[PDB]
Design a binder for this molecule. Structure first.
Ligand SMILES: [Xe]
Length: 370
């Protein structure tokens, strides 16, 4: 019983669901078809449970990485956008919504870490990681540090580790090779070594976590931090005069942050797949549709080229997209959980001195492929 003749959509409570409902009202004016938007608690946990029994919403919106698990269980319908429509979104976003080769969702928005800096302390942020040691000594002469960011979670340290060549799983020809892991290769070793060197050279502290770094930046103690769009409102409140820019390069290569793509999937059990496609393609994924959602709650950078080009007039959003285009789409496979735990341990151990960089990464690589 998935009520055919209408559309029921699930989206998280922190998104612009009121704006999404407005798009649904327009769809109804045009077609006479009602669209009901809901934002239940723990909807990402409820979806697999109810879709498994043939129930649930016609459409679900969530970060793409969770869709791999849903596709794994046959909960999502293969979508059918033609080449012309696919051409309206940035090509890399389509790589975040493929499972076993099949497209299983529509990309909506894009999120990645950026370099955030204090324009008063540093109106000219560094383009390379290599110049941060010198910069830190300079700022320290005035009682300020160059950079503080969360060193406890791989999500935040990976950009640097991947810069020169590290990667979670090799993706080539629309699919991941679970046996091809780039955690102990020369590039990862180079990046982690630079990170560890920053710590023993006293430019960064191995125990700095999310709260500590955010506090330091918003209090004007450090000139830079690395964070995502979810952190901007707290900085706005702090009144720090900040900028958001491209992450520094390492060995001349862009830092590579994981990319999260808010996406829309269609329930495999939905008797309204055609309605869903019409709604998603021709109402939501248009400048007018995304604008309606964005006005309610900002989407950040979006997958639709025409609207991203307008949003990008805000340099912070432009930065998010630039870093995302240079980043690594987050793998949507189950082995990614093994990657998180293993890398988390490797970095913590390398930073604390418990393990050398080579041994910490060697052990992590073994765990992930084992
Ligand atoms: Xe949305």
């Amino acid at each position: 019983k998935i009520e055919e003749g209408k559309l029921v959509i699930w989206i998280n409570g922190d998104k612009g669901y009121n704006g999404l409902a407005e798009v649904g009202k327009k769809f109804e004016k045009d077609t006479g078809i009602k669209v009901t938007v809901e934002h239940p608690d723990k909807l990402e946990e409820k979806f697999p449970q109810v879709a498994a029994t043939g129930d649930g919403p016609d459409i679900i919106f969530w970060a793409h990485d969770r869709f791999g698990g849903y596709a794994q269980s046959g909960l999502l319908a293969e979508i059918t956008p033609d080449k012309a429509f696919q051409d309206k979104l940035y090509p890399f976003t389509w790589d975040a919504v493929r499972y076993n080769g099949k497209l299983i969702a529509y990309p909506i928005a894009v999120e990645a870490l950026s370099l955030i800096y204090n324009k008063d302390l540093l109106p000219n942020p560094p383009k390379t990681w290599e110049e941060i040691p010198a910069l830190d000594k300079e700022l320290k002469a005035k009682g300020k540090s160059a950079l503080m960011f969360n060193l406890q979670e791989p999500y935040f340290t990976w950009p640097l580790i991947a810069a020169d060549g590290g990667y979670a799983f090799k993706y080539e020809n629309g699919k991941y090779d679970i046996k091809d892991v780039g955690v102990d290769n020369a590039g990862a070793k180079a990046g982690l070594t630079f990170l560890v060197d920053l710590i023993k050279n006293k430019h960064m502290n191995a125990d700095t976590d999310y709260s500590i770094a955010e506090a330091a930046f918003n209090k004007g103690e450090t000139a830079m931090t690395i964070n995502g769009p979810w952190a901007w409102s707290n900085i706005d409140t702090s009144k720090v005069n900040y900028g958001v820019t491209v992450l520094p390069t390492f060995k001349g290569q862009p830092s590579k942050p994981f990319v999260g793509v808010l996406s829309a999937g269609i329930n495999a059990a939905s008797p309204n797949k055609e309605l869903a496609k019409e709604f998603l393609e021709n109402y939501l994924l248009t400048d007018e549709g995304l604008e309606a959602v964005n006005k309610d709650k900002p989407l950040g950078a979006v997958a639709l080229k025409s609207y991203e080009e307008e949003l990008a007039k805000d340099p912070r959003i432009a930065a998010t997209m630039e870093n995302a285009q240079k980043g690594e789409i987050m793998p949507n496979i189950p082995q990614m959980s093994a990657f998180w735990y293993a890398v988390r341990t490797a970095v913590i151990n390398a930073a604390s001195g418990r393990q050398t960089v080579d041994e910490a990464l060697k052990d992590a690589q073994t765990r992930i492929t084992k």
